[PDB]
Design a binder for this molecule. Structure first.
Ligand code: ADP
Ligand code: ADP
Ligand code: ADP
Ligand code: ADP
Ligand code: MG
Ligand code: MG
Ligand code: MG
Ligand code: MG
Lengths: 349, 349, 349, 349
């Protein structure tokens, strides 16, 4: 039929989703208990729904749990701690976040026959490893969302021949840049996509064949498991605890505020940690270059375009240029590189 | 299980219907005899049934008749002339329109034990006049519809106590806004819907009381019978022959294409009649404003919200704004004001 | 490697085909039994195979048959009479023509693993009627062709999902001009191809929409079945016997030579029949114009570009101009309008 | 009859224009809100309507706004600030300046059944770069002007192919001197036209062939955006605060008074800035000495006669002579060179 499509991602740093109609949302993976918002309604109006997501989630048993979630929960000191957030794909923490972006990307008044061909993403070492667990949950995912301060609801339910599972970074270079660089890729060149994830960074390569079509190399491509931006939040956390000379610990919000700037305004003064920030990024820079060449022998010289993606690829790109300068480049929308890739390569159905 | 609900409208310009599950269809009120289609199927793929209603309808003899109806009938050279279309609500011209309106708005594989609360409509001055004529038709309406080139059939038959008649503009402002207009209605005010239709324009008012509940008045509210879009097509038909000066008179499509734009593509050229389109709309704007003061004395100053409706109100919303500017506003669906107004006020039972 | 593409036409006057590499062949639709040729080779050197198709064709018995086809068959006294030629698309008369059309349009030393997207054609009113007859023939067409005195052979066999049927005039104006006519089609206009062929004349229209995409109509478009060049040959055959007054009736060549010029070289003299050639063309011009008003009401004024096609349209382009002068124009290949229209609209897959 | 011809100039300094009847108007590009000049109507004679442009402008929804524009807007302190007027071609600010030029260049007793040809200009860089927007805005233009205090009006609207686009200063020497300078241009010489406008400055050249016919040279000719008379208002503005040292800034009127006079009468006394005036006048002349030679190497020696245009360079003619003295010259109407060059080369149609 005219059944719809929403491409989301389970990215532990920040959830990145897009519909079939190219409207796209982004919010961190932060949930909290939802509390009633009436006083703050009068001071500051909620124009951006994404900035202030308080929301209600009905279940199949017709109970409900309110949630400060996303940008709104990040302001809360009582949120989910998010730096030890569990990797379990069947967690209710994942259920709320998967219910969240669906509530923001289902348009108004769709026909219920026109269901949603949802497209997800799994890590490369986790795709075969954790396939049916998400297929268990998305089969069982049936709820009803209710937006606080916005007063619109969506019923949600998913079936087979609407669920569709792809690995992470699959359609990012299988399409939407493969349609463009096909004049440049000629014969048995290798394209290299490195999605710098928050927790885990994926490194995926495709070989173009005789027929200028991509074929996949699992023995040249894998996941930097635990290598990525989460170490920068981990190390720079310890870099303040000795520089403050107090044992003072920043919260979840200030740490995410830190590693975009490096200068947190602590007790009337900016504690400067620019020295360790350039150090830890170059610490992460070398940890990506060498470990990619654990999968890349002299075949690195068979590269035509080393592409990097993810939110972590943006702030590394100048230092992460040193994989192979003037051959490497950056994808256009680095965070949504999965999500735009999940859309077009999710249009196989 | 509970009984199903469909709210359609037999409006003279176009059939405007909606079901219980908030799915709506719209197509112009033109019928045509159906002819065999597999050839035009092959040239262009049919993704919309509404453009291409080739359809078979059984009767009391169980004899099928092929029909082109809706957009497909307008392109036919042999369709209904549509300017001399009958007002007899029990006519077969009204039956095939009502068959397709009930044919599209039923989903597949429903249980056959349940029945449907169908809610039709009448003109305001012709509700009492044409009450039993449609009551006789809906009791007589035993037909089985069969969509050619889509191949799904419906058995459409209704006994007593399932049909529900309302006048036009009845539940569009009594209901359908009552959850949102309740803060605007305060004490002894008049709300008013002005539906600009094909043959007629329709004026309906509702006095709200001290206890903030609307109640009807019939001497402030009537049907502008024969005054509507039909004065625009007949005037602009003469405007082409005044501008062609050849005796060439427009067909069914060319006149209907004209008053939507004003530039008929005649002999490789657009024949400009934008100014006469303004004049025919202004005389229609003359004949609704001056007739409103016939129904309204100083009580036009007793308004809190004028609403205008009809597809003819879409091109005239700023033009018919001169009744009471900065108080009149647009109904949220200009075509579907009557149908959803039939839906919410039909679910009151 | 990718699959090859050939677009031929089985037109009643002459086979008009073209391949993927834009090489075209044309020869009249006359077959003849082949006889041994080494003698006429010695008198005159053969630089054109099309004039001199002596050719052997294997079958399901793998039994070769010699054939003279094309220009070489027309000079034979014992060829097909060509006025009583069958319309049965699965006939061997159609097979040998289709064998040579596929025989010429394949270059030498192609890989045997790849297959060819062959695109044939049908009359418009006989597309649905003769759909499975050619589908049965193309599934049955297992033949090996062998060109005598040129000595290159082709193994021509096609399985399922390689043939592609289209009506005549389908892709000639839907495609083949769509990159150039897109600036001319603006809003709700009709383009029209008029192919003047041997047995029939063919009328096909396409309404463009508001979104500037053409869509087909079948009640404004049909096959002028039995009305075409065949009315000119039969009338001018009687025109010679009216002018010879001896009982001498023209043969296959003399009648075909006549209506191209009008002066058959009979007994050392040109017998003038130029005026009767004008009369037979004018009655054909009568029987396409008056039949056009049968398909077109005032919608002839809804044209932006008439196109005329067919080899019969070449001698009638200024003569059939009287439908709508200063708007009708000539297709860029009067013969090859259908074939390249099959080629571009066959490459859409 | 023949469709009426207009040629206007969209110059940001002052809007110029001339009609088919060769009557020409000029007024500054300043707008304001119109207010009821009825008190002064009793006091002083309102005869120069160009001095006194109070004007109402209807639209397609019949919602008018009053406008002081041009010379009457110069006396207003409430006018558009005009040092920061938007360079968008599709502004209402342009439309008010456009419609003012319309009703002044359409005299009474003319056939309004005949359409209106207009010939406008662009920046020479932006003639293709911002081409379609002016092509859109003129086709979108449909209003109705109302002349306050003079009580006549024009219906104002444009279809396509009545508007005509030629670049700034194109036809001023391509036409309008081509019947006179043909004796002067001999062989391989370059005529050169320099439009010293307010915001921008054009320099345009034409190679002539062997056959004494001009041809365009896009790489010896460009637009000097940010160079022109707006530098003189920019430089002398701070010179007043340099001279007065008060913190008082001149308004739009006093500043435009200053760079046409040089001696502002501030606070009961003439405050002198004549020394810095010529200093900027040499400086603007310096910036045209450079940038012309940036496109003119030794090919400047191949000239025959430079022309210069613009009201800015008109008072610069001695200092701007220094580029090529006694070969450069000034066009006779430095304001109306472009509009007559629009009109004369617009009289091809
Ligand atoms: N402007 C920015 N400044 C600093 N870090 C950023 C910025 N934008 C994104 N990031 C980092 O990138 C991460 C987002 O990665 P993302 O592409 O969402 O991968 P994942 O799919 O693993 O969540 C965040 O955790 C954040 O630290
Ligand atoms: N986009 C449009 N442009 C011009 N006219 C329109 C448009 N949409 C609707 N109309 C006019 O409105 C009429 C539809 O009125 P409608 O609300 O269906 O009333 P009714 O119930 O009497 O049929 C049509 O006949 C048509 O002329
Ligand atoms: N130069 C010509 N002079 C006269 N008649 C011609 C000429 N070229 C083509 N024709 C006529 O056009 C016919 C070819 O039509 P064609 O486009 O092949 O249609 P079809 O597809 O029906 O065979 C021939 O039978 C012939 O009579
Ligand atoms: N008599 C004058 N004295 C001083 N400056 C003048 C005079 N006449 C015109 N100008 C200057 O010339 C400019 C007019 O340029 P114009 O030819 O209209 O170019 P544009 O097409 O860019 O508006 C004005 O801004 C003004 O400063
Ligand atoms: Mg990721
Ligand atoms: Mg109605
Ligand atoms: Mg043909
Ligand atoms: Mg200028």
């Amino acid at each position: 039929m005219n059944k719809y499509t929403i491409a989301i991602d389970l990215g532990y740093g920040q959830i990145k989703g897009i519909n079939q109609d190219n409207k796209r949302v982004i919010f961190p993976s932060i949930i909290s208990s939802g509390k009633d918002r009436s006083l703050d309604t009068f001071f500051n109006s909620i124009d951006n729904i994404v900035d202030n997501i308080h929301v209600k989630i009905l279940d199949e048993y017709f109970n409900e749990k309110e949630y400060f979630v996303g940008e709104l929960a990040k302001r809360q000191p009582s949120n989910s701690s998010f730096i030890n957030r569990d990797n379990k794909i069947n967690s209710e923490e994942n259920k709320v976040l998967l219910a969240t972006a669906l509530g923001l990307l289902i348009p108004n008044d769709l026909p219920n026959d026109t269901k949603i061909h949802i497209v997800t993403g799994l890590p490369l070492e986790h795709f075969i490893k954790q396939k049916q667990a998400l297929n268990d949950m998305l089969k069982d995912f049936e709820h009803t969302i209710k937006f606080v301060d916005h007063n619109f609801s969506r019923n949600i339910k998913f079936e087979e021949s609407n669920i569709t599972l792809f690995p992470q970074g699959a359609g990012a270079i299988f399409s939407k840049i493969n349609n463009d660089i096909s004049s440049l890729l000629i014969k048995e060149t290798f394209i290299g996509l490195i999605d710098v994830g928050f927790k885990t960074t994926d490194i995926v390569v495709f070989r173009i064949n005789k027929d200028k079509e991509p074929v996949f190399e699992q023995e040249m491509s894998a996941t930097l498991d635990g290598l990525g931006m989460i170490n920068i939040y981990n190390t720079m956390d310890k870099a303040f605890t000795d520089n403050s000379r107090d044992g003072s610990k920043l919260n979840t919000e200030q740490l995410m505020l830190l590693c975009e700037e490096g200068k947190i305004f602590f007790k009337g003064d900016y504690i400067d940690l620019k020295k360790d920030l350039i150090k830890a990024r170059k610490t992460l820079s070398t940890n990506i270059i060498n470990k990619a060449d654990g999968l890349w022998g002299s075949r690195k010289n068979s590269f035509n375009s080393i592409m990097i993606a993810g939110g972590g690829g943006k702030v590394l790109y100048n230092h992460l240029k040193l994989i192979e300068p003037n051959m490497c480049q950056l994808i256009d929308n680095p965070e949504f590189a999965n999500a735009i890739g999940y859309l077009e390569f999710g249009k196989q159905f």
